[PDB]
Design a binder for this molecule. Structure first.
Ligand SMILES: COC(=O)CNS(=O)(=O)c1cc2c(cc1O)C(=O)c1ccccc1C2=O
Ligand SMILES: O=P(O)(O)OC[C@H]1O[C@](O)(COP(=O)(O)O)[C@@H](O)[C@@H]1O
Ligand SMILES: O=P(O)(O)OC[C@H]1O[C@](O)(COP(=O)(O)O)[C@@H](O)[C@@H]1O
Ligand SMILES: O=P(O)(O)OC[C@H]1O[C@](O)(COP(=O)(O)O)[C@@H](O)[C@@H]1O
Ligand SMILES: O=P(O)(O)OC[C@H]1O[C@](O)(COP(=O)(O)O)[C@@H](O)[C@@H]1O
Ligand SMILES: O=C([O-])C(=O)[O-]
Ligand SMILES: O=C([O-])C(=O)[O-]
Ligand SMILES: O=C([O-])C(=O)[O-]
Ligand SMILES: O=C([O-])C(=O)[O-]
Ligand SMILES: [K+]
Ligand SMILES: [K+]
Ligand SMILES: [K+]
Ligand SMILES: [K+]
Ligand SMILES: [Mg+2]
Ligand SMILES: [Mg+2]
Ligand SMILES: [Mg+2]
Ligand SMILES: [Mg+2]
Lengths: 424, 425, 435, 417
């Protein structure tokens, strides 16, 4: 079986609780997190985190997405930062146990319409192959359409994460989310635009609505602010990181903590440590039931397979859900049900591998082997790639159970199969 | 469509509380799904005619009960043959053929402590005549079940033993009896004499609840439509009783004198069929599925893990059916324990398993007769297609429906591990 | 276990093995069913009232005394049979048997008298019904079971036929056809309660659908806080046989589990060979079924569904029921003029008996329509100080409770009273320790 | 509607989060008490008057700093600023005085001296530092002597042993303080939130006050506005179920002590309206054990009645504060207005969330029933003056059958004016 020690780790006594109150009462500081950290860390790259050597330390500390703030620097400066990130990422393309795809996100300066500088900076993003755009001061659905249009003919695969920074953005949230790929709760400007004591209501509301819609939500700004000058954060700061994860955030961000502060690597390490602890403390019993009850009935086989797979993973305490995905959509639909099992996404798309870091609990594996002549053989080779990487990284052991999600024919949009596999 | 959400008590099924669920029950909401609670009809003078048995199979009879408290071995062998003859008269159309189980109900131990000598003889008769199930009378402890198992010998290992709880000791030792039995029968006639009559409903509801929790079949028996022995229509208490046995969670409902000796055997089967369909639509699945899920323990068995994943997927898309390939019936039983609204269409080559799965609510057995294909994957698809074709013929499926298909990774029993979402074309 | 540990040490483990208390503490309905125990005996008094149809088998004063002792709470007179002279003799015999026990509170049982109308037959109120309803007013009947109610205007016609003198009579509309089921909400709004008349309903709609109509109407009446009666063929075989069938005992238990305030006996008591035994059987089943009710979910659902209220009687009633559940109160003693304060307690389905102390003989008979209400008729002349008249009535309920099994030394009771005399001013809840 | 009522009616916690509205303004009075540490920046009588008006309910004196002479001057200045508002008895705000001990280090003689100072100066609460076991609480209780029988002991959990022995400490303490500063050094900083949420949950279950403390608005020591993490932290302590929130250096030595109190007040009001009462009340009620105590039985009946009619307040007559504490444990949305003649109980009841103490200084009526009705009308008049009540509102009134402590057993539904 698994043993009594297995059921004492990763807050499993608190997870089995019949009420939220009992769940809180059963939280144990001695119950150690075992699962890999599922909340992605976005680190803002600036003078303090630009060097190739510093970026290697940040990748090792847990950075998944590199943010380039186009409110500062120049095109030449950000292109050098992008090249340094790509160089530090590719320095691990040898050791499979260390290679990790890192997304590149462009944060716009902001706006009567889209600013001239935004148009130029967005074009720069397309030309430099950025994966994500954090669009500043989004107030309505037409602002997202303008950013979408500026991403031109070559950039329609770039993800647009709309930053909600003012009262109008909060009030028009539903129409913005409908046309955006995700949302960033941009607390800095939001805390100036609306009373500071109301920001938590906007954060909790937007995270809840994004979780319900199955779209990524980023919690941003001043999460570990004091770490710009101090080697350890305050009690309010560690609490804030933990509570953003407990709220349901897919990503957490570092701004000045990594862009200009004295402790960029330590700030990433701190976010990693807190997120792991907070993910184990999530009350999955009620969360899954509520995501289940609130999500409408679906006749989309990818959505139907995803809920079946997450239910199966919870039933056997599956070590992982291995999904084959071209666009990342199959992994995103698994992620919306918040499984405790890691979602190992095997893809041939280098861009999808970087973009799936926006989805909580998705661990991308970029597959570069040449295709098999028989499609079913090519599928099994990718499933075994996910198992062998999982074994290598520590996610899996022989005798573990995994859930495998695939489709019935090649190409995106046909996911409809869930298999229960025993690791051999 | 908007009309779809009007039928099969779907407004009452979406209710957030049990009280609102009751308030939304609609007499104009027609049941659409196939009747999932099995009907056991006791065979007798009123129901041994081969032509009368054909009418009863068409009316909904799933299990033929042979009461060994009456008649000789020669009488019961003629009952078995008349049953098999009426069942096999429909084998010429394999897409509409209905398997019918044969159950032997023992006389019991009487003033005796354990397996009576007559029961030893009757049980061996059952093995020799290939009965599918034994309804073991007056089971009081786990050792009574072991004695019935021993009397069936090495050749009767596949026969299902349903322990009849008919007295206080059986109720008090219920847990140990259920652990070693394949299922339970709430034998209300003797139970109502052995314990105060006003307490039988507590024993019925408790045993049904515990069997549902254990995932084992439970039969509600005796006097369900008693007045239909002489009258063409039942009383208000009788229709209520049938509906409430289904709402309690019974897998099977039974007819005794109503089919064995009465004047309305076909109409008593039609009546149970009509009530069960209405009551199944009125089940509050929202709470029931949540509770069965929360109470079911964690499992490392791939059949069990696939079953809950498949039931969850079926609810998510309002799947018309869950088509499962099964050798012993176990994969269909594990689907059935989560009480899906979707019909569990079980495709099997075992004629015995096809008969025995009638004990599990919502399992519709299809007997596959074709010899195996050389390529195993093609043999699985042909059986899946046979389920789709049978389901289309029988009204379970239409083009455009979504179905969940449950299969395994290699031949033989015990390897179910795959769930597929399929669109009917 | 932690929420019942101190109370288990105080009241004892035997207290918590009775009245299905292990099944009542269950966290799910499934676990609640699994914990039902045939050895867990009912302790509480029977709360679902029994309506017995009075006919040739149950008319004698001596037979009626046996039926009152067996548990009959409401005597039904079916105006589809007999004559005015026949039913007046039945009424007089019921009143004579009821008053033969008027010697003390520790032995008095008030019994309501209900008139069941013949019906309209082939649209408006029939001329026979106008005559029969006038008979009911003249003979002081407490309730009218109005046959074949199809719309709100049918109820208004019955109310009009009762005249100015029959304003206090309760109108229980009988739902017997498809139109009455479809127009249920408008009928319930203007009626005092409902009767699920399963005999005609089972002929008017498919017999296999009657259970849906019964469960729906009971649920809606529970939600509205109005009495609902389950009627017809509950113990049918007991007309000739001394014991009922397994379906019949199941039906009675399920009507109580559904949420019915009253259960009825028709030919079972009017013409059968075992009228007293039929009443005893319904009494035995109802007590067992009341203990098996899953109060944990039921109370939560009645609370969540009941709208917010600014009526102090309504606010006091929910507070009193909550307090009674918290301490396992033996009773909730309420002072009432019309029965309304006791009815508002009853709508939350407390496990504690609602002992209603009233001076109104009619209200004492009519509160039998509400599940768990035990009426006590107070006969003493008023005290000079109103506060001391209130205290005397509360003590009358505590004295009847003490020597009637209900209350014991060391028991907690919840007492519900008002701030001024007259109907409509209930607003006080007190926790009292009995000594 | 206002006070997050659309989010409060939600059928799931997820839908409740989705319905939270920045435009839905808080209407109810702030229920989470603010403890402000008094030091050089908040010592002056004039500064203390502005802090009382900003929302300070409990004045904390940290015996890790200063001297007995210094803290006695602080106590006198607090009492002077509090009494400057006693001319209007319908608006007078009681303020508790809490002594925070230095601690044991490697019961110390320093602590024995400081605890006797507290008894001699009439302190209402002792924040007992570094509590590791039930015997540490007994030692603090012994040092308070026979004259300090009524002082509330709030045990500070600041290390691994305190967390592990939490249950035995809570059973003998009056309440708990989650002392996050030392706890964040004694255990990994990323685990403190688990200890905070667990201790708050267990105290809510036990019906005992819990204080969230340290670095809640830390940046406000030098800056006029807090960080986004800080406002989030205050809101989350209230959402966790904390009865009190604390300010240390923010009020003791910082440049913006009044602004820090105003900030905690503003956040707490917003966070209290965002509490999901539908699930919280049902969980507190299901988990609270069955009781034969009439005060306990009346308290749940009164909270249930208050929710049923959206009562503006629950007015309770209490001697020791116990009847108000038993109402508070069910977390009613209605303000618990506690009318008390004891000045000590009025100060100590600030430890319980949603309890608003009213000190009774009117002459006693000759008839006891008349005396009770006047204390009840006093609650109504103070409520009307302070904005808690309006004509037409419904209030729940909780009283006893006989004078003296321990006889609460009555709940009445009253319509205002
Ligand atoms: C002042 O902080 C901000 O307004 C927050 N924005 S940021 O965290 O993305 C951030 C980016 C940057 C720098 C600092 C910095 O905090 C910076 O000093 C800097 C300096 C020179 C070039 C680029 C940057 C840059 O991108
Ligand atoms: O998540 P996405 O983008 O829909 O990709 C899922 C697709 O990947 C697969 O599993 C395998 O497809 P490929 O063989 O083309 O990689 C498909 O069967 C399925 O439709
Ligand atoms: O329910 P059972 O008896 O375990 O049978 C399920 C088995 O049926 C199958 O689906 C088909 O197997 P066969 O080809 O041997 O019939 C197996 O893959 C699976 O293990
Ligand atoms: O239930 P009802 O009909 O509203 O009667 C309750 C009334 O009974 C009382 O408790 C006592 O009133 P009386 O003295 O008129 O009998 C009132 O204070 C209260 O208004
Ligand atoms: O809350 P406590 O400490 O039990 O005190 C509440 C007490 O207050 C009262 O309401 C009034 O008491 P006093 O007359 O002593 O002021 C009592 O009836 C009740 O017992
Ligand atoms: O731009 C941002 O990140 C903000 O304003 O918080
Ligand atoms: O054997 C039976 O069917 C019974 O006793 O009810
Ligand atoms: O009228 C009735 O009582 C009936 O139809 O059942
Ligand atoms: O002593 C304290 O208050 C702390 O350590 O947080
Ligand atoms: K920017
Ligand atoms: K038999
Ligand atoms: K009639
Ligand atoms: K200190
Ligand atoms: Mg900004
Ligand atoms: Mg029998
Ligand atoms: Mg009729
Ligand atoms: Mg400290």
């Amino acid at each position: 079986e698994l043993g009594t020690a297995f059921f004492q780790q990763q807050q499993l006594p608190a997870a089995m609780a019949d009420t939220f109150l009992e769940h809180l009462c059963l939280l144990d500081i001695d119950s150690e997190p075992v699962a890999a950290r599922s909340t992605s860390i976005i680190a803002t790259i600036g003078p303090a985190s630009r060097s190739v050597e510093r970026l290697k330390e940040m990748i090792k500390a847990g950075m998944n997405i590199a943010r380039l703030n186009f409110s500062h620097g120049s095109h030449e400066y950000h292109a050098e930062s992008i090249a340094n990130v790509r160089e530090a990422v590719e320095s691990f393309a040898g050791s499979p146990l260390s290679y990790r795809p890192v997304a590149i996100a462009l944060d716009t300066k902001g706006p009567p319409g889209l600013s001239e500088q935004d148009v130029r900076d967005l074009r720069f993003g397309v030309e430099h192959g950025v994966d994500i755009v954090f669009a500043s001061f989004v107030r309505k659905a037409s602002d997202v359409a303008a950013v979408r249009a500026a991403l031109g003919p070559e950039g329609h695969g770039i993800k647009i994460i709309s930053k909600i920074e003012n009262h109008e953005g909060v009030k028009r949230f539903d129409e913005i989310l409908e046309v955006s790929d995700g949302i960033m709760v941009a607390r800095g400007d939001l805390g100036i635009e609306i009373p500071a004591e109301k920001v938590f209501l906007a954060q909790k509301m937007m995270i809840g609505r994004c979780n319900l819609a199955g779209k990524p939500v980023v919690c941003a700004t001043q999460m570990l602010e004091s770490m710009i000058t101090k080697p350890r954060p305050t009690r309010a700061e560690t609490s804030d990181v933990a509570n953003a994860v407990l709220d349901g955030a897919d990503c957490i961000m570092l701004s000045g903590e990594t862009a200009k502060g004295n402790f960029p690597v330590e700030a990433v390490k701190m976010q990693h440590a807190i997120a792991r602890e907070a993910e184990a403390a999530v009350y999955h019993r009620q969360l899954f039931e509520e995501l289940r009850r609130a999500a409408p009935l679906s006749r989309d086989p990818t959505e139907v397979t995803a809920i079946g797979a997450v239910e199966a993973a919870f039933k056997c305490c599956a070590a992982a859900i291995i999904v084959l995905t071209t666009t990342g959509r199959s992994a995103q639909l698994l992620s919306r049900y918040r499984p405790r099992a890691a979602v190992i996404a095997v893809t041939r798309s280098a861009q999808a591998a970087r973009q799936v870091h926006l989805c909580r609990g998705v661990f991308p594996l970029l597959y570069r082997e040449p295709p098999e002549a028989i499609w079913a053989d090519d599928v099994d080779r990718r499933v075994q790639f996910g198992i062998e990487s999982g074994k290598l990284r520590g996610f899996l052991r022989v005798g573990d159970l995994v859930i495998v999600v695939t489709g019935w024919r090649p190409g995106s949009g046909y996911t409809n199969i869930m298999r229960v596999l025993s690791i051999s």
